[PDB]
Design a protein around this ligand. Structure first.
Ligand code: P5S
Ligand code: POV
Ligand code: POV
Ligand code: PTY
Ligand code: GBM
Ligand code: ATP
Ligand code: K
Lengths: 97, 364, 285, 151
């Protein structure tokens, strides 16, 4: 849709003089405006999906940490010591990338 | 991280204004013409593929004798300090190995024993003492509270080594200091060169005059002037030498290069037939392959060291049609030189043609 | 994370330097579009007949003295078919510019029906005149809408006749696609289609006031098209200030300016008077 | 030409185009983004703080597995809040970018229309087309992710 809009804009820019004189400044601007609206209604989905990607990349590690720590409580008998918890958080941050 | 890995959007970025309209291609960014000798009187070429002759250990010494006074003092001090330290370590090791450190500790625990019959060096019991003993042997103070006994010959060997090394270092450092004292007037060069060289008219013929002067009070004995033109020339048989140096005579009533330089002087070369600059006109002296070198040589009477001062002029520096204002004007009862008017030039009227053409129709 | 900061900051610097171009563009503005609230709205019947001469036309559309007029006026009478003769001193810059006050009108303008051309909203004024291209200018999309998107009476009444009126394209009436057009191409017959489209646009609006220029070909087929146009466009009294590389404005010249070089002298007139006044320009070619 | 003018403008950021771009989608769509960003980062700090408190408070009393239910509840509620704020921030950033792009393009096209003939004739056509293609692409698909990553 961007290429279509660019072709229309070049067509309304190259032949500019007759357009300005013939009182057709707005007649060949509305077509580009409509194509631009089409472009945004096509780009909204791209923005949605990229935001979803950012969200997942930021959120999956914290959920993994939550599950891996809550699991120990019920799974195991004894209390958890920092020398393992913090090592494991550093390991998760190493593994994410 | 991975900025533009996706690489689809290209091949249709339209031409910029400077691209299509052709305003960018107006570069006008030519590199300057390569000089042969700089304005600062320093030749600047680039010799390459010279077979390296290695180095010699003599080069370190040659550098050592020629150093700034702010480095001679530092190397002086460092050499002496390092020598004292090295031999201090040797003396401390000798004391350790012979069993003198232990002996002194045991007989100073009950210090009433007071036994020092069998020790390599008396009263050396720690490393501080070894350092002080090495200081007293290298500098030859010799207080005598830490003697050298006749007990262990390794100590005598180290003593001989230390005396000889101290003598070597002392002799070398005195030699360096004396050499730097002998070269005490040898500072720098103070020959002043005019900045622009005019091409005036004098006695009906053109010239090529510049100005040269002194700053040092010491006279210059048997001064000599050489002037050369550097250009690429081709023989009729067609051999091209990229940089040919051709010598141009200097005007002098007895045809000699000897200049007597106390007050500033004007050095003229007259444009005759064989002159390289016979066929150059003022309108040609805008873009031209032309570099004129000037070399003045002599001996400063104080030091008696030969000095050579060079300079070079190109087409931009030459001021066709000017002359030099008189720097010298009499004071109340003594000649005077206003050195602020040294390189100042005045403008006068001279023919615009070349001497190539200025003597084919002389009555002009 | 101590590396992402510098890298992303430099990238953002480059991109902001990119948006700076748009920020620069939005600042500039010119060519004021407004209406001076003319009395009675200057009804369309008034700026649809004849024309009015500009008193002391001193157009300053440059930094140097324009060759078109150096305090030089003109005599544009009702039906004063005009012409242009010369190469540089005579041009269509002032004519086209001041046709609808397009390029820097300074000292007066055309007071048609008592109301000036300048004191009119840009829209109506640009839609109440005409001009010729002197170059084929095509477009994309079907030829149905090119003439006008609301020409319901003429286009319906003349389905293929409106295009045919200036020049009868027979297979346009029965084409592969109903009023289909070849985008940005087909310039050969488009040379005449330019005249046909301009005539249609200015005829449905019933304007008839134009300023032509620089016929590129002037071929025999173009001559027949010109004859048809004269039957249609130049049949009305209001005629254009024709210009061309070859001097063919003297067939029905009435009131023009002889501008061989430097300035323009408003002296062109009927055949004998044109030859006497503009003998140099008519004898150059 | 640098002239110590474009030189300084190269050594430092524009800082005024950036502010205009940031405040182009409105003013309540900006402080929302900063608010959500800061809250999410503070929460992500606080969850680690709480994890440290839980880990250190019961390091010694290994036989005594008491007070093992309050800590887990705190950790889980903090994790939920962090996940929600993460979900919020990306959507806010992309909404701001979308609105800013829309407004910029519409204003550019609505101000290019009222352009004098001297502007079009003097200015080469290639420059205008490059401005639309390059600036539209950069301001639509490139600035939001860069800004989000930087922040
Ligand atoms: C591992 C070990 C670590 C070691 C760490 C570093 C140890 C450093 C310790 C000492 C550091 C000293 C450095 C100080 C630098 C100051 C130099 C200062 O003397 O400059 C003064 C000049 C220096 O001329 P130049 O720049 O070298 O150029 C060379 C020459 N002029 C040229 O242009 O070509 O120099 C001169 O011009 C000559 C100076 C002569 C010195 C004076 C001696 C005095 C004798 C005369 C008797 C006077 C009475 C003195 C009594 C004083 C009372 C205490
Ligand atoms: C750069 C500055 C040089 C300064 C070096 C000396 C450091 C201080 C002296 C010192 O450490 O004392 C020690 C030397 O210990 C050593 O042997 C250090 C030798 C290092 C030499 C450094 C060369 C560079 C003393 O060691 P000791 O001789 O075994 O003492 C005897 C025991 N008693 C004192 C109880 C009798
Ligand atoms: C550069 C180094 C110069 C060093 C010169 C000093 C030599 C010490 C001499 C010495 O004391 O000899 C002694 C041992 O002491 C020894 O062990 C000497 C061993 C020879 C050292 C040669 C090293 C090389 C020998 O002493 P004596 O056996 O009792 O001699 C009695 C015989 N007489 C009385 C005739 C002399
Ligand atoms: C010359 C430069 C000497 C620098 C110092 C080196 C001395 C430290 C090492 C000494 C050593 O090796 O032991 C000595 C024997 O070696 C030796 O006698 C030979 C020394 C070899 C290194 C030179 C014993 O020393 P000792 O036998 O005298 O001690 C007991 C007497 N009761
Ligand atoms: C940064 O990547 C990683 C990060 C993490 C991990 Cl576990 C692996 C990688 C990885 O496998 N990386 C591939 C190697 C790599 C890295 C960085 C970069 S880069 O410097 O960011 N980009 C540029 O250099 N582009 C220039 C300019 C135009 C084209 C020529 C190169 C470029 C290439
Ligand atoms: N009064 C002076 N004292 C020391 N050096 C001088 C003096 N006048 C000229 N020079 C030397 O002349 C060289 C060229 O200087 P510069 O081109 O600035 O001016 P100039 O042609 O010498 O004369 P002026 O300074 O009057 O223009 C410099 O290297 C400078 O050292
Ligand atoms: K003594």
């Amino acid at each position: 849709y961007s290429t279509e809009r660019l072709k229309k804009t070049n067509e309304i820019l190259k032949g500019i003089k007759l357009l300005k004189l013939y009182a057709w400044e707005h007649i060949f601007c509305k077509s580009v405006e409509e194509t631009r609206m089409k472009e945004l209604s096509s780009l909204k989905t791209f923005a949605l999906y990229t935001s979803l990607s950012i969200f997942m990349n930021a959120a999956i590690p914290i959920a993994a940490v939550l599950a891996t720590f809550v699991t120990h409580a019920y799974a195991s008998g004894n209390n958890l010591k920092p020398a393992e918890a913090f090592a494991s958080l550093s390991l998760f941050h190493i593994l994410v990338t | 991280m991975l900025a533009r890995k996706s690489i689809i959007p290209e091949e249709y970025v339209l031409a910029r204004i400077a691209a299509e309209n052709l305003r960018k291609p107006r570069i006008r960014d030519r590199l300057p013409k390569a000089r042969f000798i700089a304005k600062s009187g320093a030749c600047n070429l680039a010799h390459k593929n010279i077979r390296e002759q290695g180095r010699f250990l003599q080069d370190i010494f040659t550098t050592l004798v020629d150093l700034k006074w702010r480095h001679t003092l530092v190397i002086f001090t460092m050499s002496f300090l390092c020598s004292w330290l090295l031999f201090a370590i040797m003396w401390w090791l000798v004391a350790f190995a012979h069993g003198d450190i232990y002996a002194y500790m045991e007989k100073g625990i009950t210090e009433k024993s007071g036994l020092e019959s069998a020790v390599c060096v008396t009263n050396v019991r720690s490393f501080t003492s070894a350092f002080l003993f090495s200081i007293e042997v290298q500098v030859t103070i010799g207080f005598g509270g830490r003697m050298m006994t006749e007990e262990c010959p390794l100590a005598i060997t180290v003593l001989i080594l230390q005396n000889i090394v101290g003598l070597i270092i002392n002799a070398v450092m005195l030699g360096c200091i004396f050499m730097k004292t002998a070269q005490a007037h040898r500072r720098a060069e103070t020959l002043i060169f005019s900045r622009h060289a005019v091409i005036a008219v004098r006695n009906g013929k053109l010239c090529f005059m510049f100005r040269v002067g002194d700053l040092r009070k010491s006279m210059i004995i048997s001064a000599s002037v050489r002037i050369q033109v550097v250009k690429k020339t081709t023989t009729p048989e067609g051999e091209v030498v990229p940089i040919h140096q051709q010598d141009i005579p200097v005007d002098n009533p007895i045809e000699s290069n000897n200049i007597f330089l106390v007050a500033p002087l004007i050095i003229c070369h007259v444009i005759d037939k064989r002159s390289p600059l016979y066929d150059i006109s003022a309108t040609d002296l805008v873009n031209q392959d032309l570099e004129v070198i000037v070399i003045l040589e002599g001996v400063v009477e104080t030091t008696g060291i030969t000095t050579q001062a060079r300079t070079s002029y190109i087409a931009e520096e030459i001021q066709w049609g000017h002359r030099f204002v008189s720097i010298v004007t009499e004071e109340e009862g003594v000649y005077s030189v206003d050195y602020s008017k040294f390189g100042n030039t005045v403008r006068v009227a001279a023919p615009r043609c070349s001497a190539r053409e200025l003597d084919e129709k002389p009555s002009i | 994370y101590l590396n992402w900061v510098v890298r992303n900051l430099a990238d953002l610097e480059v991109q902001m330097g990119a948006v700076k171009k748009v920020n620069s563009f939005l600042t500039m503005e010119s060519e004021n579009y407004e209406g001076t609230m003319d009395p009675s709205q200057v009804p369309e019947h008034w700026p649809q007949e004849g024309e009015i001469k500009i008193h002391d036309l001193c157009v300053r559309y440059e930094n140097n003295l324009k060759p078109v007029l150096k305090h030089v006026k003109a005599y544009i009478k009702p039906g004063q078919k005009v012409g242009i003769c010369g190469r540089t001193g005579s041009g269509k810059s002032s004519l086209s510019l001041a046709f609808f006050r397009m390029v820097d009108i300074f000292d007066g303008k055309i007071v048609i029906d008592g109301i000036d051309i300048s004191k009119l909203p840009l829209h109506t004024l640009r839609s109440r005149l005409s001009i010729i291209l002197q170059d084929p200018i095509l477009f994309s999309g079907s030829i149905r809408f090119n003439l006008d998107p609301e020409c319901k009476c003429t286009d319906d009444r003349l389905w293929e006749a409106l295009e045919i009126a200036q020049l009868k394209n027979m297979v346009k009436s029965l084409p592969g696609g109903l009023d289909a057009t070849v985008t940005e191409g087909g310039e050969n017959f488009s040379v005449g289609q330019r005249q046909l489209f301009c005539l249609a646009r200015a005829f449905v609006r019933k304007s008839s006031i134009l300023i032509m220029d620089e016929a590129t070909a002037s071929i025999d087929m173009a001559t027949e098209n010109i004859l048809q146009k004269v039957v249609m466009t130049a049949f009305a009294d209001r005629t254009v200030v024709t210009i061309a590389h070859r001097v063919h404005t003297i067939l029905t010249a009435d009131l023009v300016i002889v501008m061989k070089r430097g300035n323009i002298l408003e002296y062109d007139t009927p055949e004998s008077l044109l030859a006497q006044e503009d003998g140099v320009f008519a004898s150059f070619v | 030409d640098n002239m110590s003018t474009v030189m300084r403008l190269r050594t430092k950021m524009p800082w005024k185009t950036c502010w205009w771009y940031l405040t182009s989608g409105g003013f309540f769509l900006l402080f929302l983004m900063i608010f959500s960003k800061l809250l999410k980062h503070s929460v992500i700090v606080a969850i680690d703080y709480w994890l440290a408190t839980w880990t250190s408070e019961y390091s010694i009393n290994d036989p005594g597995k008491a007070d093992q239910t309050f800590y887990v509840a705190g950790f889980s509620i903090l994790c939920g809040a962090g996940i929600f704020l993460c979900l919020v921030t990306s959507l806010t950033v992309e909404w701001m970018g979308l609105t800013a792009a829309k407004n910029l393009h519409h204003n550019l096209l609505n101000k290019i229309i009222l352009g004098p003939i001297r502007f079009f004739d003097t200015t080469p056509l290639g420059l205008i087309l490059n401005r639309f293609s390059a600036d539209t692409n950069i301001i639509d698909q490139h600035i939001p992710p860069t800004l989000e990553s930087l922040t």
